[PDB]
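Agenda item 2: zinc ion complex prediction
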Amino acid sequence: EPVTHPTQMTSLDNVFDDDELRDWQEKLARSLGLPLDTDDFTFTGELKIDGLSVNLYYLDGELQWAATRGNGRVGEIVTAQVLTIPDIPQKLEGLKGELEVRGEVYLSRADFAAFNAQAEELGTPLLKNPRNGAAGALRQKDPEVTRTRHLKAILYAVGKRDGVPARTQWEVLEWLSAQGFPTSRSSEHLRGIAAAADYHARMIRAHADFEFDADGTVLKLDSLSQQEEAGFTSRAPRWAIAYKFPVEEVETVLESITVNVGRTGKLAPLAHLSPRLIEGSTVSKATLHNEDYIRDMDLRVGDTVLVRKSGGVIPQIMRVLPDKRPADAAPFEFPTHCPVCGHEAVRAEGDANTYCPNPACPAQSFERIRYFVSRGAMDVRGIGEKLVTQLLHEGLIHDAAGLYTLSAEQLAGLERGGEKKAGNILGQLEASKTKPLWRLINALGMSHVGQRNAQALARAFGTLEGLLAATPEQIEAVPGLGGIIAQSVTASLADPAMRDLIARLQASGVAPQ
Ligand SMILES: [Mn+2]
Ligand SMILES: [Mn+2]
Ligand SMILES: [Zn+2]
Ligand SMILES: [Zn+2]
Ligand SMILES: [Zn+2]
Ligand SMILES: [Zn+2]
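Presented output:
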């Protein structure tokens, strides 16, 4: 829900090298009517954080709402999600008047890379940059989603300051941290344009050694009496500026392209390059995403390419270099079959991921077995992650049907000598055989086929034989599953390992309800 900011959140100008910072001081000293050759200016140096700017509003000391920047005048109320952020106060004593604290909600570099890595082997959408990741965490209807993402935030300015005794920006930061606000660890009280450029350089050589992406520094004029005088240009003020860090893009050569199979089945590619040093670490493997990403980038195997790290962490590629291409470099013939199991590998009409059929693929085996067992499937309490891993280390089960073919002595003759718990585990098996039919298709673990899609698939036919014996046209005509879900369903049943798993399942005695 939109809300109008009390004071408008203006943007900032950008300086990239030293000469542009000198023109910045020249513009500032001129806007105040001072001799151009002056270095008496006291500054304040924060960091430009790769996140989302957020504004707070405290009336009579008590918190009212938390909103995003939006367009600089009207933001979006994220009152509940910002309160999932830890050290966020809601009541300041001895304070009366409109308080407007400004800040920035960022996301940890490790929490950021672990998300895209989760999205890489799964096929679910991926985070572009730390700003979209912070916005993707804030803009969530359920605040528990934001709480489960470790959303961390920093506040580094104040606008409407009714009842704030701070008279300089350095005392603003002191007053913020004194009231219990989460402030920036690195913020220096600078004097002179030379000390500001030195500070910016020291943050450059500390860019990689942070827990959060900082894409530059922020230089503010110390005296508030001078801030409320220099004024604004049009979109940015004349008393504060952002000094961006230099770009970090290293040129290297692409060597080999490999493919890994995700636990779900995502056929995720991977690029291997000549090991080059970026900032500090030596990057040699780059994320390659999906097939259409390669085809759009025209990444013929053997090309020389540019590469960086997304937010300073995730190594993603940039583009190709046609001037340095070999004439014999052929376009990468994308694999049509699974590399680790051999079975066919086909993708849907619109889905960019490629996926893999059923369980013979060792990358899916463990995930398919434990998904077959959970509450969302066949309800087999007793069989846990520590037990399934042993059944694969010893090699007693192949797919989910191998569980029903086990004996009481095979499960009792294991670790800790559990006889009665093997009886409880066995009882859940035959009790699962007479469970409803919709719980079976979901337990197979096909792509896109969730708990809701498996129920609509069950209402489509009703009988198990009607699903195996049904043309692709009559199964694409089901309501709920168009031409992307139903197309992924047909590829599963057309696979022999799925037909073998289902046949062994009915051979053990599965007659759904
Ligand atoms: Mn950076
Ligand atoms: Mn960045
Ligand atoms: Zn320059
Ligand atoms: Zn975390
Ligand atoms: Zn096979
Ligand atoms: Zn496979």
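Discussion summary: The longest strand covers residues 250-261.
Owner for follow-up: CH.
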